[PDB]
Amino acid sequence: TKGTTSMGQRHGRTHILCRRCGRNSYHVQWERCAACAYPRASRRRYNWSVKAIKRRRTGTGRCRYLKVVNRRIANHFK
Amino acid sequence: VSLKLQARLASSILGCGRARVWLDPNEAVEIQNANSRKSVRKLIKDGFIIRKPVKVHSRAR
Amino acid sequence: SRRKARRAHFQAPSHVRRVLMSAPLSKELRAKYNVRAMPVRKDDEVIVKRGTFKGREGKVTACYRLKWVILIDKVNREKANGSTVAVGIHPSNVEITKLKLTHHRKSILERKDRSSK
Amino acid sequence: THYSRKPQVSSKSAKAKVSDLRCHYKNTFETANVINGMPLRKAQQLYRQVLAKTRCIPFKRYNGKIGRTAQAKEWGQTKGRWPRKSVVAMMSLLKNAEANAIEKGLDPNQMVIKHVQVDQAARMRRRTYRAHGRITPYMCSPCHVQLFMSEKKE
Amino acid sequence: GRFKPLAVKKKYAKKMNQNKPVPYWIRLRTGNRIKWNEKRRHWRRTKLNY
RNA sequence: AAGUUUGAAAAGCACUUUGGAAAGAGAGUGAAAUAGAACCUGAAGUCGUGACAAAGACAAUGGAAGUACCUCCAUUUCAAC
RNA sequence: UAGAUGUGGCCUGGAGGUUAGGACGAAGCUUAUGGCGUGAGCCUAAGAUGGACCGGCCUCUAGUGCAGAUCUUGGUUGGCGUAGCAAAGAUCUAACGGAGACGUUGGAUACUGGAGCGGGGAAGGAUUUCGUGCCAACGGCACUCG
RNA sequence: CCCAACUGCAGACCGUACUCAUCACCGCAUCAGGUCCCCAAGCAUAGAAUGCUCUGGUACAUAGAGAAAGGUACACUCAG
RNA sequence: UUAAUGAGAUUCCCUCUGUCCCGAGUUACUAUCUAGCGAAACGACAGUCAAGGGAACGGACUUGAAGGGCUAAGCGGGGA
RNA sequence: AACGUGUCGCGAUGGAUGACUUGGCUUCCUAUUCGUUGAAGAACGCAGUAAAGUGCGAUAAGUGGUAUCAAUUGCAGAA
Ligand SMILES: [Mg+2]
Ligand SMILES: [Mg+2]
Ligand SMILES: [Mg+2]
Ligand SMILES: [Mg+2]
Ligand SMILES: [Mg+2]
Ligand SMILES: [Mg+2]
Ligand SMILES: [Mg+2]
Ligand SMILES: [Mg+2]
Ligand SMILES: [Mg+2]
Ligand SMILES: [Mg+2]
Ligand SMILES: [Mg+2]
Ligand SMILES: [Mg+2]
Ligand SMILES: [Mg+2]
Ligand SMILES: [Mg+2]
Ligand SMILES: [Mg+2]
Ligand SMILES: [Mg+2]
Ligand SMILES: [Mg+2]
Ligand SMILES: [Mg+2]
């Protein structure tokens, strides 16, 4: 039927790992990340999910060059 | 005390399979001291781990 | 505030945690140098002024400077198995009786003393 | 904290516990209360015959649709069982409190089981699986067992 | 089963190492908040799929 | 979801012995272990055993009014109103 | 009853005042602890409770009173040791190990029956492999095994 | 000149354990469900039928004691 | 209108039978008892009847009649 | 009798409450706004002993400079 039986036909993969977003939303067949729109230069970003914007903003990661450059520009250098 | 390892790989040295390797029961510390498929090949050469004959599936009927 | 002080205290770096762990000099070692109190250093002989081990003199073995305590060499404590351990008296409960020299301590000690004189 | 009742003489008494006794509170309840005034030797003699299934544990208060048996008439009932795991688990808690009677210098052949007390522990959890995808609990319900002893002067 | 990219292989190896217990020199540290690892995966319970 | 917020200090129960080891009983630490790491307090709910009126079921509860016995609960008298 | 209104009227959190307690034990908590208020409630005592905060009064303030929302969350409980653990292979023994129904070896009888409880792969899973331990909880029984 | 044959040196990257299922995957789970491919013995027999066997694999799917009623069966017979 | 085909709908006949007259015996597996394990749905309180009245078919009210208690296996009348 | 009650003392479970609060929220304020000179993001790494996290990048739990003084600390090690 359409429950435990049809759950057995779950062989393929719709999504694989996104080289840019690092998560598992890279739709294989039409090759685009379902969560950052890779290979689109702009990452997908929609105001109708501000909560998901917040999971993806700056500072949510390492923020290497900024934790440095924000120190240089706040000390009269650049 | 358990002879699972010495029985698993002696069946992989005799190349027969289980229920064909006969691990001598009257001595296990002899077999248990094997713990290696070269120390078992020596054991096979000695009395302790014979391979029992396969079977007689008659065909005279 | 209450909230920011109990954070700058417990979140204080190590070199800050040493001036927050200063102990008063004895009654006859202050006017020896004319200052009020010093941060405790390893190997500076002291005397406890408060606690179960009060009035017990000893040489500071270490400044265990994240427990917020100093370790005195004669203030020990027994575990269950005989092995003796060292209890940590907060420096403010201690009164320094000895110092350790330095061309950076009897120079800052008269930086504090040049305030008086 | 310890021990609902004090033995009313502490040197003429032994004490023993378990905390996570690993089996049913309800089987362990009557396994324990069945020996609650007996001498220590008459209590092991009970349990060691419950295991040979010649005497039973009269289930009171947690009988609840257990089968009737002939061996429960002495206990004034019709119901009773032979819980092996809860009996072998107090063969051990008693022989502990024996070792506490020798340790103080008390003949265990004089010990009376005063005040057994069984109660409930933290009730471990391991889900099971119902029809239609309903994940129901399958609580384990361990138990604590207390008991102390005493002597009877001639 | 036998085909995994090397990149997908580098990511399960980074998970086989993260699946070790907290060593018993961590819980005697002065003020740690760690008693268990609380990120241990079991291959049956939860899957990584990467 | 999750304050392990034990204690001032890990001083985190050495050691004895019952257990195959856990755990238990002892000791011992400390102001408290009746603060023993699933640790401040520790409630309700439910449960356990000990006691009892040891009562007494023939729904529970409750109302009023008594009585039985029992309550370191209050008060008063305790050569007096 | 719906409703309205009053109360020098009750209560919770906090503020401004005042009065005042507290390691000679505060909040809290317990109750056959009484008393006293018609009541909301307050006060006391006594805790083999608790360990460090807080009461009264006048104003102020509000996230201020709960039994009932197929309320929400957490926890417990009855039914209850009850339904059940009934499709798919029947374990039987020796002597051995072990702290001990368990395991191992031997023998025995079987089952799968070559569209397999076989040997290899893809998809998927990614250490599940192996060995040596281990046996707390997990393997819906148990385990010395996993 | 050009190629072969003979030598000489070198031959790099990734995968590779295990699994592939009544315990490893999906099904919430060690779930009677689902899931692609290869290898395929003997005899009866038209024979990948079905029955039984050699190889290989497996007898840790809870177990025990019994005659209720009632029940469920890839369980039966039943006078006229 | 039609030959063929039909897990289509329908009627009869033949055979055949436990569909039945009318049931009975046997068998596994269960239920039953035990060791181990252990849920849940549901839950105001509950819980013997008749009659009366009543939101007009009451477990509680009224008036009668039974009812000692606690129980195991059943069953399916009621608990609208 | 046992069971079932029922009140009391003591326990267990439970984790409310109170007390605490390096967190939140709100309000205000003082200055300056990343990237092709490769950002943000994520990936994998790095510790004598480190799984996570924090920090860092094969100079990897940091090197340099100054400025400070004697620790770090679970315990090694180390002027
Ligand atoms: Mg494609
Ligand atoms: Mg492009
Ligand atoms: Mg965009
Ligand atoms: Mg408020
Ligand atoms: Mg409100
Ligand atoms: Mg409420
Ligand atoms: Mg309710
Ligand atoms: Mg399956
Ligand atoms: Mg899923
Ligand atoms: Mg065979
Ligand atoms: Mg017939
Ligand atoms: Mg309901
Ligand atoms: Mg009846
Ligand atoms: Mg019945
Ligand atoms: Mg709270
Ligand atoms: Mg900008
Ligand atoms: Mg780069
Ligand atoms: Mg990291």
Query: Which residues are CB-contacts of B48 (< 8 A; sequence separation ≥ 6)?
Result: B23, B24, B27, B30, B31
Q: In Å, what is the CA distance from B2 to each residue of A6, B5, B33, B40, E13?
A: 44, 8, 11, 15, 34
Q: Which distant-in-sequence residues (6+ apart) come within 8 Å of B50 by Cβ?
A: B21, B22, B24, B44
Radius of gyration of chain B (CA): 13
Residue owning tokens 């649709």: D65
Contacts of C57 (CB under 8 A, 6+ apart): C45, C46, C47, C48, C74, C97
Residue B40, Cβ neighbours under 10 Å: how many? 25
Angle between helix axes D84-104 and D40-51 (nearest 10 degrees) is 160
Tokens coding C100: 């350790």
Q: Which two tokens stand for residue C92?
A: 């403010």
Classified as helix, coil or strand, C113 is helix
What are the E-state strand segments in chain D?
A: 15-18, 114-120, 128-129, 135-136, 143-148
Give Cβ neighbours of residue C58 (< 8 Å, ≥ 6 apart): C45, C46, C47, C48, C72, C73, C74, C75
Q: How far apart are CA C63 and CA A35, in angstroms?
A: 53
Q: How far is the CA of D84 from the C1' of G100 (A)?
A: 14
Q: Is D148 helix (H, G, I), strand (E, B) or coil?
A: strand
Q: Please check whether residue B30 is in contact with residue B43, taking contact to mean a CB–CB distance below 8 angstroms.
A: yes
Instruction: Report how far apart, in Å, the C-alpha atoms of B3 and of each of B33, B42, D136 are.
Output: 10, 16, 42
Asked if A20 reaches chain E (Cβ–Cβ under 8 Å), the answer is: no
Paired residues of C77 in beta bridges: C85
Q: Is the CB of D55 under 7 A from strand I?
A: no
Nearest chain E residue (CA) to A17: E50
Q: How was this structure determined?
A: cryo-EM
Cα C6 from chain centroid (whole Å): 20
Report residue A53 CA to chain centroid gap: 10
Cα separation, D52 vs C116, whole angstroms? 93
CA–CA min distance E8, chain A (Å): 9
Return d(Cα A20, Cα A33) in angstroms, integer. 8
Neighbours of C50 (CB within 10 A): 13
Helix or strand or coil: residue D65?
A: coil
Positions 18-37 of A with beta carbon below 7 A from strand J are 20-23
Which residue carries 């009395």 as its tokens?
A: B47
In whole angstroms, give the CA distance from residue E50 to residue E5.
10
Resolution of the coordinates in A? 2.8
Other Cβ atoms less than 10 A from the Cβ of C72: the count is 25
